[model samples]
Target: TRDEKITYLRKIIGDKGSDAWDVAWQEGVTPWDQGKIQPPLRDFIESNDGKALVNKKSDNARVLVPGCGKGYDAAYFASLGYETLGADLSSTAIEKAKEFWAESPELKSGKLSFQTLDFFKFEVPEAKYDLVYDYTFFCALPPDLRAPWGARMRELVRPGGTLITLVYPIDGARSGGPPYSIDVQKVTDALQGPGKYWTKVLDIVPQTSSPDHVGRERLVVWERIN
Candidate 1:
């Protein structure tokens, strides 16, 4: 019965390396796909806080969604006129993202694209991203990789850019995971530790969340401040 309860989690063992995500995508075992823009994000985008963030940005402001699955959040960002790129290591996930992009006129109206990339290894000639959004990514990563995740985020975002983390599954039992139970403080420490690059800007329990994430997700925003 334990195995039955964790059948989905067992299907995507974090120890199996990034290929585990690929296999999970191919097998349709994704429990994380809410199939719509996360409501907290949608609410944030419509709020005054959101308008200030996006409206102040240039249309050319680059936005990255790491570990983007079907790319709903990425599409939403692009719709707001940001140059958005959704990166996932799974080729199958990218393919599905493209398929969804093809079918949705809204997703196509702005600069939006998907790529298969190892987030830790991705780089460009310059690090100037305006916004980096992480939803389920940090929790999905093995705890050991937290350092690298913080390192990459620091390298990719420019000073004054924003990092939006929709911290989820905040109250789960810490037994097993593709989503390891997340302690908000631990997430904070990973970035604000020694040689820190982020300054927390906003932290709140959003009033609107998907039914499954109600009371289980928090919206936290940090600004890159080296």
Candidate 2:
């Protein structure tokens, strides 16, 4: 059973590459692009303590969205007075995101920005961001890079900053993935390890908009303990 799971997981992760995402963008195969803000995230902001939860004393509380495919969420944060940056490995994706922002009157105000950079090699400005948002970024990453992802988050968020992740806990090995299955334990282990931060699942986001993701999602919020 274990070997079978591994085989299945490898197949999914292997095929699901940035190259594939690139091709999808070029070919226009992304259904995940709802052409609007994600409903659950929007609801979270409106309903939860979006203003109170973020650092008020910081200058606009810089926000970073890594693997930001189209920058929708970044734009949303920017609108809420955050200085936002969205980064992706795909130049095409980055350009598209920028173009989208350029056309939007709200985003054109200059609070939001986008860049193309590889996640691991991407240099985060020293202790810059007050918050970091993770949507599909974690599941999209190769399992081996999970630790690096946590370390990067630690580096990006300033002391007392927060990292909010919308994690989909599907074990890639068992189910095969692009919507990979990473359980809660794996996420906890990676984020709470040495030189990382104190992390916790804030809530299991209720009223999921996507039916396929029902009972499979969590809203994890990690406070940088440094």
Candidate 3:
């Protein structure tokens, strides 16, 4: 059944763009929505690396989560006291995110907000963010968009900011992917190799992850260097 769903999703999510995802949301087939903050993210925040990050946060540290379906991760960051914004291209997703946010009164206490914006073409907010988190967002794109995704990430984070990517489904056949299989090389080539805008600071296979993502996911954190 899972394989069949993946095959069906691959057919309809050909372009992996807004319209494709809008349909996914409307149809309730988003396998990516875990309904809670990712375990690695929570672990990272509690680890020494996370403590260091929190210690160095700017007075008005801000976080941005692009392709933030349901806003779970964004709200998690907000709960931790960061000004967090969750952006999505699908209006339906954003509306659902707001509804989810409203249902959780504790999450509302923090500076969490949602907006519908294309990650590549969004207007720069008043200030660049101090942190950005990417989960399934990267793999959701077609291969051609990876470069632009890296460039946009650099533009959005301040010099001392961080980007945390939860690389998933890392060991699958490379073809027919809405979640295109990814390797660290592909990610590094864009952010650290060609542009040299980011430096790898932390890379680890998280101790815990969703059951399906247990071995297939890795946590890599980078800092904007230039």
Q: How many clashes in each candidate?
A: 0, 2, 0
Cα lDDT tens digits for candidate 2, 34-81: 566666677667655554674363676788888898888888888877
Question: What TM-scores do the predictions have?
Answer: 0.91, 0.82, 0.92
- Report the number of the highest-TM-score candidate: 3
Candidate achieving higher lDDT, 1 or 2:
1
What overall lDDT goes with each candidate model? 0.83, 0.72, 0.85
Best by lDDT: 3
As for candidate 1, its clashing pairs are: none
Error of 3 at 218 (Å): 1.0
Residue by residue across 95-153, what tens digits does model 3's lDDT show?
99989888665456658889898999988776899999999898888888898898898
User: For residue 103, what is the lDDT in candidate 1?
Assistant: 69
Model 1 — TM-score against the truth? 0.91
Instruction: Provide the clash count, candidate 1.
Output: 0
**Model 2: worst 10 consecutive residues (lDDT sum):** 4-13
> Which prediction has more favorable TM-score, 1 or 2?
1
Alpha-carbon RMSD of each model: 2.4, 4.9, 2.0
**Candidate rank order under lDDT:** 3, 1, 2
